[PDB]
Design a protein around this ligand. Structure first.
Ligand SMILES: CCCCCCCCCCCCCCCCCC(=O)OC[C@H](COP(=O)([O-])OCC(O)COP(=O)([O-])OC[C@@H](COC(=O)CCCCCCCCCCCCCCCCC)OC(=O)CCCCCCCCCCCCCCCCC)OC(=O)CCCCCCCCCCCCCCCCC
Ligand SMILES: CCCCCCCCCCCCCCCCCC(=O)OC[C@H](COP(=O)([O-])OC[C@H](O)COP(=O)([O-])OC[C@H](COC(=O)CCCCCCCCCCCCCCCCC)OC(=O)CCCCCCCCCCCCCCCCC)OC(=O)CCCCCCCCCCCCCCCCC
Ligand SMILES: CCCCCCCCCCCCCCCCCC(=O)OC[C@H](COP(=O)([O-])OCC[N+](C)(C)C)OC(=O)CCCCCCCCCCCCCCCCC
Ligand SMILES: CCCCCCCCCCCCCCCCCC(=O)OC[C@H](COP(=O)([O-])OCC[N+](C)(C)C)OC(=O)CCCCCCCCCCCCCCCCC
Ligand SMILES: CCCCCCCCCCCCCCCCCC(=O)OC[C@H](COP(=O)([O-])OCC[N+](C)(C)C)OC(=O)CCCCCCCCCCCCCCCCC
Ligand SMILES: CCCCCCCCCCCCCCCCCC(=O)OC[C@H](COP(=O)([O-])OCC[N+](C)(C)C)OC(=O)CCCCCCCCCCCCCCCCC
Ligand SMILES: CCCCCCCCCCCCCCCCCC(=O)OC[C@H](COP(=O)(O)OCCN)OC(=O)CCCCCCCCCCCCCCCCC
Ligand SMILES: CCCCCCCCCCCCCCCCCC(=O)OC[C@H](COP(=O)(O)OCCN)OC(=O)CCCCCCCCCCCCCCCCC
Ligand SMILES: CCCCCCCCCCCCCCCCCC(=O)OC[C@H](COP(=O)(O)OCCN)OC(=O)CCCCCCCCCCCCCCCCC
Ligand SMILES: CCCCCCCCCCCCCCCCCC(=O)OC[C@H](COP(=O)(O)OCCN)OC(=O)CCCCCCCCCCCCCCCCC
Lengths: 171, 48, 98, 175, 311, 347, 80, 110
């Protein structure tokens, strides 16, 4: 058939969030609060385009806003955050409940120096709305033309012309 | 006791799942660039 | 076609031909029949896991339950035969020739 | 070799079915079917269907082949075998199993890699861990939806098991 | 480094099985107003070593086996299934951390009856085969109530994960919401391992030599210590500090020793059942209660709004 | 058997067949066959002699092998279609295996080798259930998968069924074996017209069930299991002498009786499709069925009459057997050919 | 109904305990004030990503941020 | 992989202890013993009741196989349906036990 079209390796270069999973999970709720809008633009673009090739620039905006989030942590609250993700990182299942005092100190320093309120239980799982300036994909599945259906029956039901017509049965 | 503690464990589960949900767009963008990187590398090696 | 599925179907056909070639015992026939069931379990499981098709995950459990109830029925029939004759030989089961 | 573990376990599975299907006795046939159930369960477990493989061990090998061996021991009257001193009674066992595992190695010959390397299964075989599922097993949630979604399936299965109890108690009474 | 962890599991299993024989003979001694072994070692510490060397140089019984293969594979399967029941045990961390460790242990304990069946068929005696069939029927009968009790308690666990069952019991021992399931579980584990008052085999594998009889004996005691550790983890869950795991290890080890001594103290207190009396005890007493409490632990976390999490 | 247990088990047989009929999922089809087999086994062992246990064992083995081949067909369909709708199949391997499995379930030839033995071993009421009610579920599945059925395979199994069900009835004096070979021949006739017009399949199935139930009801009403014992009926119940035998003139297919209706409509719908050799040879083999069954008619309302003295004692007792629907089934199995265009209700 | 109950609690107390526990397990969740909370907790447990909606211009109930006041609340779960 | 390595270790230790416990007393040259049971030599009597308890095990074990996904089934959004089908499965297991009772099936191994 046709050539599958792939982006170049220069279309795929972006500065990477080179931190570990406990480091991401320790700042997770503040990341969902603060980096909400480009993340939600990207996931709307991702469930609407249904294609990772049409979402590359929104993914770069996600990566950029994540890097700005972690720079803004690093400039202000580096030591409480490091104290918190070290304790998150010790755990096997990476529990939040084992690390409440380091969470309290991290939230205290973040609300003081930056004003970020940690989201309550229930908020980050809400379905939000996103204002976009890209058009809606009119055929994301690239479906071709549908087959024309068989014509229905219409008209009243007249009786059988001279009955069953089975060899000699007149009705 | 199991009533109180299993309600607490459901709240802690929802907290962990909201942490995952906040992390998912970053991981999805990285996964997209990951598989496109790998397909482009395989395409260039198919060409050579 | 696909690679490991050819092996599981070949196991099914070997246990089929074992059931389709009686040597001495009715128990060996039930063994070949339940080997056929085992290969059906493995093959249905590998397809349903490969396809990531969620609601058919309960299908091989139902296969196992219905056919193990079937095997309990076969063991009870074999026991009634062996209490009639003394052995479970298939050549003792030939009174319906006439 | 270690990539091809599912294909190797399938070859062991086919060889075990050849083992009991030639039917030396129902007791050795039961033993071969137990070994075949274990290696086919290994085939299932090496895709990630862990509940289904544990259903094999717990239900198939754990109840049904137990009842097969239990019924087989109540028929086919036992008789002794060779029992000469420990070279014969265990050394022949060790050499026989050595010949069997060397047969498992010997069926993987240059006539087999003509089917293997032409239609290379590994590299792209187990695509189960392609991307992310989440905080669940898809296999476990599909099995768990027997109660929310599979209402009719539960009704007909539980009714057939009740009828199975009734049917066994009718045909085994002999009256 | 992982092989070090596997061997430091499996070799202390064999040493604890070796000295459980000493602990059993001493505890049965003092409860019977006498002493156990105190001459061979200092208070009997060399008695398991002397017993093991005696059993491994004793003359083989020289059987005419009905099968070579099953005669050899019944001790091998008994020991392998005795040793593989230990690898998912969270003490506090399991050797093999698996999502379905409870179901793994239930499946590997269901496989344990083939050692009984193959050992009974691999003898020429018909009386040995009859005793093995009765032992197999006892064991498969009590596995039913094992599985249903275990499912009912896992309805409070949330998953089949063994390590989660410590998290489940961080506020209360799980014997407090489930003491009838605990006591029927305990008697069902007492009847799984052919343990008095349920050891009718001593009232099936008497064709083996002294060495292979020691192998079946040590597989049985690994099963006994294992089921007591599993019952401890399942109903009497210890405190787990994730920074000092040895606190949990000392705590569950003391509780599992007490529960194994409770097995020793029940076999020194009761007459045996007749065979139909424990068949009655299962099928007409434990199993109706087990089904009723299974309905109760299905419907109770829904009426209390206390469904545990999957993760 | 406890009559409550008998009613629950017969409802489980009927429920398994209804589950095969109404369900859209292949697993529920397989479940309905498993439930139907499991429930019908105690109906066969209702009297607890060695013949019924042997017959139940052979029936279990054949139906169990057919159920396993049915599930293998379903699994191959899931390979090549990724779905479970009970409709056409998406591999000729799955179509071949499911046609073989349903032919084993029907006892169509060459998988016919269980039907006379199993019908011989079990009583007359369970034989009636096995030759009428158990045909309904595999004919329903063959009705729903006919876009996939290989033509040469189903025509080969149909002609082999009609030929073997013909040549099986020469050497027989046992009535249940005669009804079983009549079953094999009639299932060949039903599957012959399946890929051309399955309404004629349903017509042949309904007329065959009416005639078979008339014959088994008369065999229960006379307590006769052999030809030699059926021939004492004229001295005992003379109205039974004519009803059995003109119903048996219906069953071979002979006008003006209603058993000529299915074979004539099958010949009629197969010659629309330019097949002339095949209905001619199939109905010549049906004349071979007429040959043997007319010899039985001669033996019962003609030559071999002779009686015994204890008939003089049976004369003083009327029947208390509930000959349920026997005049209805006897009128439907004989005088229904003037109402032949009623077959459009099965369309 | 009270003589039979004392008679069966004298003869067979195992089965009386079984039928009583099973009867409570049947007819008790229909009477509990917390059965609705099991449903509300199970449908508030977010296994999937909350895929956002394209803002057409008239959705005054769908929030634009998690910390916006509109949207479903889990303050009943933190309080109880 | 760690599981299979541990299984291979356990199997190798078991086979090694079996091999030592068979071969170490055979090094003894003790004696060649001459002429090495309650019933004399008769056939094994079949007992119908042992078979009935094995089949009752198998059927209740299949019902237990149906019961096993309940700790995962509690997590559902269709909780009324799930609770009804769970209580119906355990009730059908109890009806199987009651029918097994009231037909003298659980007798002489009760
Ligand atoms: C629609 C499909 C309907 C299919 C037929 C359903 C009924 C028959 C099958 C079940 C069965 O065996 O029932 C017993 C059966 C009697 O069976 P039997 O052994 O043959 O009867 C012998 C003596 O008649 C027994 O006599 P008795 O001394 O015991 O007492 C008299 C008895 C007692 O009467 C009653 O008990 C009736 C009053 C109670 C009724 C129920 C109330 C609740 O009356 C009768 O039996 C008179 C004959 C009844 C008619 C039988 C045939 C019915 C028609 C079958 C379909 C024919 C289709 C031809 C198509 C041709 C073209 C294709 O029927 C009845 O008892 C009542 C039948 C009612 C028919 C209604 C027709 C319209 C339905 C709509
Ligand atoms: C103002 C408001 C009130 C107005 C009321 C007006 C009427 C007043 C009287 C009320 C009663 C009316 C009765 C029905 C009307 C007359 C029907 C008629 O004659 O059709 C001629 C019909 C066709 O002749 P047509 O000249 O073309 O049409 C004249 C009319 O237009 C016929 O009309 P069509 O062309 O529209 O007819 C439609 C179609 C016309 O027919 C066709 O298209 C031809 C195909 C017919 C079927 C052929 C099947 C051949 C293979 C099977 C043979 C079976 C064996 C023969 C019988 C053995 C003994 C049981 O009919 C059929 O296909 C039905 C099947 C045949 C049944 C005919 C009616 C029978 C009712 C009484 C039955 C009593 C038992 C008699 C024996 C049973 C057999 C008849 O003749 C035949 O088919 C030959 C057979 C004779 C017919 C039955 C005669 C009924 C009276 C019998 C009295 C003696 C009974 C003795 C005791 C019992 C027997 C031992
Ligand atoms: C796991 C940690 C340890 C746990 C505790 C276990 C350790 C203590 C062990 C003691 C020694 C045991 C040695 C073996 C003994 C074996 C014999 C035996 O005990 O048989 C069991 C006996 C058997 O009964 P039986 O044989 O004595 O009685 C005769 C029975 N008939 C009449 C049928 C012949 O009892 C049971 O099966 C009961 C099991 C426990 C049930 C718990 C019920 C809890 C209460 C429920 C509610 C009650 C009120 C009703 C509802 C009200 C609602 C508002
Ligand atoms: C002589 C009696 C037996 C043959 C009966 C043939 C009936 C008939 O309509 O034949 C015309 C049919 C004509 O068939 P047809 O008309 O469909 O022919 C093909 C179509 N055209 C006309 C375009 C060529 O003849 C046959 O089919 C010949 C074979 C008859 C059947 C085999 C007989 C075997 C011995 C008995
Ligand atoms: C896990 C438990 C602990 C480990 C197992 C036991 C640890 C000790 C292992 C070595 C014990 C000594 C060897 C086995 C016992 C031999 C006893 C015996 O009967 O010896 C006489 C036997 C036979 O001596 P004999 O020739 O006088 O025979 C007497 C019998 N008649 C005269 C009738 C023929 O000696 C041997 O068979 C010698 C075998 C080798 C000796 C040991 C070599 C080093 C092994 C290390
Ligand atoms: C005896 C059977 C009694 C219980 C019947 C089912 C109870 C129930 O909650 O069903 C709802 C369930 C499901 O209803 P639901 O309300 O959960 O549906 C919501 C939709 N889903 C499943 C996608 C979330 O089943 C049905 O409605 C259809 C299946 C059962 C139909 C009745 C069979 C009766 C057989 C009698 C013999
Ligand atoms: C996790 C912990 C596991 C622990 C496992 C072991 C449990 C037991 C602990 C120790 C118990 C007591 C040990 C000492 C036993 C008695 C030895 C003894 O007294 O032997 C004396 C005997 C004769 O000496 P003789 O020279 O004749 O003296 C005449 C004096 N005029 O001389 C002899 O018999 C010769 C010397 C024999 C010495 C034997 C010593 C004990 C061997 C134990 C083996 C296992 C050790 C532990 C392994 C695991 C830990 C590293
Ligand atoms: C005569 C022959 C010899 C007889 C003696 C020896 C054999 C009998 C005694 C040992 C039996 C061993 C059974 C091993 C399988 C048990 C089930 C199992 O694998 O469970 C563990 C785990 C499931 O847990 P889960 O957390 O869901 O999975 C990890 C994903 N996070 O799943 C995993 O972790 C999967 C790991 C990879 C898959 C391994 C599967 C087992 C190896 C193949 C079969 C080997 C046994 C064959 C013989 C069986 C008995 C006949
Ligand atoms: C597209 C079609 C879809 C489906 C449409 C409907 C299909 C209907 C198929 C009918 C199949 C009939 C199967 C057999 C009857 C079932 C009930 C039964 O078991 O009856 C036998 C019963 C046994 O009683 P028992 O105690 O065993 O007596 C022996 C002596 N002690 O009692 C007796 O033995 C009593 C003696 C008389 C028995 C007569 C039974 C007649 C049943 C058939 C009636 C005619 C068919 C219905 C009309 C046509 C439908 C196509
Ligand atoms: C509705 C909820 C669900 C109910 C079903 C599920 C229950 C869970 C437990 C399942 C039990 C399964 C087996 C039950 C069999 C009952 C029949 C029975 O056992 O009858 C015999 C027995 C007399 O015993 P026997 O025959 O002598 O045995 C030898 C030892 N003595 O006779 C008896 O012991 C009589 C037994 C019946 C009467 C028990 C009455 C208890 C009432 C408690 C209060 C009401 C609770 C609410 C439920 C309604 C109960 C009617």
């Amino acid at each position: 058939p046709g050539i599958v079209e792939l982006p170049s390796l220069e279309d795929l270069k972006v500065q990477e969030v080179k931190v570990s999973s406990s480091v991401l999970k320790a700042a997770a709720h503040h990341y969902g609060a603060q980096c909400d809008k480009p993340n939600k633009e990207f996931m709307l673009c991702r469930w609407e385009e249904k294609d990772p090739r049409r979402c590359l620039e929104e993914g770069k905006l996600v990566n950029q806003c994540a890097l700005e989030f972690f720079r803004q942590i690093k400039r202000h609250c580096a030591e409480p955050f490091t104290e918190y993700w070290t304790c998150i990182d010790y755990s096997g299942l990476q529990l939040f409940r084992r690390c409440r005092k380091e969470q309290a100190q991290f939230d205290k320093c973040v609300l003081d120096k930056l004003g970020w309120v940690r989201p309550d239980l229930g908020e980050l799982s809400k379905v939000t709305k996103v204002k976009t300036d890209r058009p809606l994909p009119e055929n994301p599945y690239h479906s071709r033309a549908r087959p024309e259906p068989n014509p229905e029956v219409e008209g009243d039901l007249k009786p059988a012309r001279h009955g069953s017509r089975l060899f000699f049965w007149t009705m | 006791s199991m009533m109180r503690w299993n309600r607490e464990r459901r709240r802690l589960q929802i907290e962990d799942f909201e942490a995952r949900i906040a992390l998912m767009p970053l991981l999805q963008a990285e996964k997209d660039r990951r598989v496109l990187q790998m397909l482009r590398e395989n395409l260039e090696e198919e060409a050579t | 076609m696909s690679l490991v599925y050819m092996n599981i179907m070949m196991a099914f056909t070997v246990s089929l031909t074992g059931l389709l070639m009686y040597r001495s015992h009715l128990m060996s026939s039930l063994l070949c029949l339940e080997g056929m069931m085992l290969s059906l379990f493995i093959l249905a499981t590998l397809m349903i896991l490969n396809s990531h098709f969620t609601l058919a995950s309960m299908m091989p459990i139902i296969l196992l339950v219905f056919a193990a109830c079937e095997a309990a029925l076969g063991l009870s029939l074999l026991v009634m035969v062996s209490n009639t004759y003394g052995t479970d030989y298939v050549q003792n089961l030939n009174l319906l020739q006439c | 070799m270690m990539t091809y573990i599912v294909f190797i376990l399938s070859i062991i599975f086919v060889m075990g079915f050849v083992g009991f299907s030639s039917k030396p006795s129902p007791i050795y046939g039961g033993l071969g079917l137990i070994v075949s159930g274990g290696v086919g369960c290994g085939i299932v477990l090496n895709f990630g269907g862990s509940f289904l493989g544990l259903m094999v061990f717990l239900i198939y090998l754990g109840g049904m082949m137990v009842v097969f061996g239990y019924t087989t021991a109540m028929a086919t009257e036992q008789y002794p075998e060779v029992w000469v001193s420990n070279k014969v009674v265990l050394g022949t066992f060790i050499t026989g199993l050595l010949m069997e595992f060397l047969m498992v190695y010997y069926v993987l010959k240059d006539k087999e890699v003509e089917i293997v390397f032409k239609f290379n299964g590994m590299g792209d075989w187990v695509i189960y861990d392609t991307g992310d599922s989440g905080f669940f097993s898809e296999e476990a949630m599909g099995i768990a939806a027997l109660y929310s979604y599979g209402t009719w399936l539960v009704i007909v299965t539980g009714w057939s098991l009740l009828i199975g109890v009734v049917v066994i108690m009718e045909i085994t009474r002999g009256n | 480094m992982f092989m070090i962890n596997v061997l430091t599991l499996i070799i202390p299993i064999l040493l604890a099985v070796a000295f459980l024989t000493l602990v059993e003979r001493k505890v049965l001694g003092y409860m019977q107003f006498r002493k156990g072994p105190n001459v061979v070692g200092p208070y009997g510490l060399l008695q398991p070593i002397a017993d093991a060397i005696k059993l491994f140089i004793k003359e083989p019984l020289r059987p005419a086996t009905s099968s070579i293969s099953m005669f050899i594979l019944a001790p091998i399967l008994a020991l392998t299934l005795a040793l593989t029941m230990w690898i998912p045990l969270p003490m506090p961390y399991p050797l093999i951390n698996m999502n379905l460790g409870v179901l793994f242990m239930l499946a590997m304990s269901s496989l344990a009856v083939y050692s009984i069946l193959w050992s009974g068929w691999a003898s020429n005696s018909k009386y040995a085969l009859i005793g093995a069939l009765r032992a197999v029927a006892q064991t498969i009968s009590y596995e039913v109530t094992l599985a249903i009790i275990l499912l009912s308690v896992l309805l409070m666990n949330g998953s089949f994960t063994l390590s989660t069952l410590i998290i489940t019991q961080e506020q209360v021992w799980l014997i407090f919401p489930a003491w009838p399931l605990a006591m029927m579980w305990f008697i069902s584990t007492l009847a799984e391992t052919n343990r008095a008052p349920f050891d009718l085999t001593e009232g099936f594998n008497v064709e083996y030599a002294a060495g292979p009889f020691a192998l079946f004996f040590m597989a049985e005691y690994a099963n006994i210590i294992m089921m007591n550790i599993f019952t401890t983890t399942l109903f009497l869950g210890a405190f787990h500090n994730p920074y000092m795991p040895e606190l949990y290890t000392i705590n569950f080890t003391i509780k599992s020793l007490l529960l194994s001594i409770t097995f020793l103290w029940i076999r020194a207190s009761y007459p045996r059942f007749r065979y139909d009396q424990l068949m009655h005890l299962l099928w007409k007493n434990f199993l109706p209660l087990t089904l009723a409490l299974c309905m109760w632990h299905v419907s109770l976390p829904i009426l209390l709004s206390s469904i545990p999490p999957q993760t | 058997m406890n009559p409550i247990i008998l009613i629950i088990i017969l409802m489980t047989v009927m429920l398994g067949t209804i589950i095969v009929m109404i369900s859209t999922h292949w697993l529920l089809i397989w479940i309905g066959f498993e439930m139907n087999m499991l429930a019908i086994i105690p109906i066969m062992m209702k009297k607890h002699n060695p013949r019924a246990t042997e017959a139940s064992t052979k029936y279990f083995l054949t139906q169990s092998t057919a159920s396993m081949l049915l599930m293998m067909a379903i699994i191959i369909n899931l390979m090549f279609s990724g779905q479970w709708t009970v409709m056409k199949l998406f591999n000729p391997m799955a179509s071949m295996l499911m046609t073989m499995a349903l032919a084993m379930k029907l006892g169509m030839a060459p998988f016919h080798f269980w039907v006379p033995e199993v019908t011989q071993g079990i009583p007359l009421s369970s034989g009636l259930i096995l030759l009428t009610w158990q045909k309904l579920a595999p004919m329903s599945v063959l009705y729903q998968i006919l876009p996939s059925i290989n033509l040469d395979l189903i025509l080969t199994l149909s002609i082999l069924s009609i030929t073997i069900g013909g040549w099986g009835g020469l050497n027989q004096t046992q009535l249940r074996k005669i009804m079983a070979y009549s079953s094999i021949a009639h299932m060949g006739w039903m599957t012959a017209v399946l890929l051309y017009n399955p309404t004629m399949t349903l017509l042949n199935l309904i007329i065959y069930i009416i005639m078979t139930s008339t014959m088994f009801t008369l065999f229960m009403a006379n307590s006769t299991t052999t030809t030699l014992s059926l021939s004492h009926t004229w001295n005992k119940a003379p109205i039974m002498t004519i009803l059995v035998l003109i119903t048996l003139l219906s069953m071979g297919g002979l006008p003006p009786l209603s058993g000529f209706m299915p074979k004539w409509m099958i010949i009629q719908e197969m010659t629309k499709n330019d097949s002339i050799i095949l209905p001619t040879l199939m109905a010549i083999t049906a004349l071979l069925n007429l040959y043997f069954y007319m010899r039985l008619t001669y033996s019962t309302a003609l030559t071999m009459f002779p009686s015994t003295n204890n008939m003089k004692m049976k004369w003083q007792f009327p029947t208390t057997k509930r000959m349920t629907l026997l005049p209805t089934m006897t009128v439907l199995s004989t005088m229904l050919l003037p109402l032949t265009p009623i077959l459009s209700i099965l369309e | 109904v009270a003589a039979f109950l004392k008679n069966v609690w004298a003869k067979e107390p195992v089965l009386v305990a079984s039928f009583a526990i099973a009867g409570l397990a049947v007819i008790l969740p229909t009477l509990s004030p917390y059965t609705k909370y099991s449903l509300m907790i199970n449908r508030a447990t977010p296994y999937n990503y909350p895929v956002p909606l394209r803002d057409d211009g008239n959705m005054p109930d769908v929030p634009s941020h998690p910390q916006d006041p509109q949207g479903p609340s889990l303050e009943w779960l933190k309080r109880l | 992989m760690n599981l299979m390595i541990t299984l291979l270790t356990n199997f190798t230790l078991a086979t090694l202890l079996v091999t030592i416990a068979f071969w170490l007393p055979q090094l003894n040259v003790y004696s060649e013993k001459t002429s090495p049971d309650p019933m004399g030599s008769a056939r094994l009597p079949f007992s119908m009741k042992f078979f009935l308890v094995a089949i009752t095990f198998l059927l209740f074990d299949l019902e237990i196989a149906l019961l096993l996904p309940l700790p995962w089934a509690s997590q559902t959004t269709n909780l009324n349906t799930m609770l009804t089908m769970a209580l119906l499965l355990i009730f059908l297991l109890a009806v199987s036990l009651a029918y097994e009772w009231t037909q003298k099936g659980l007798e002489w191994t009760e």
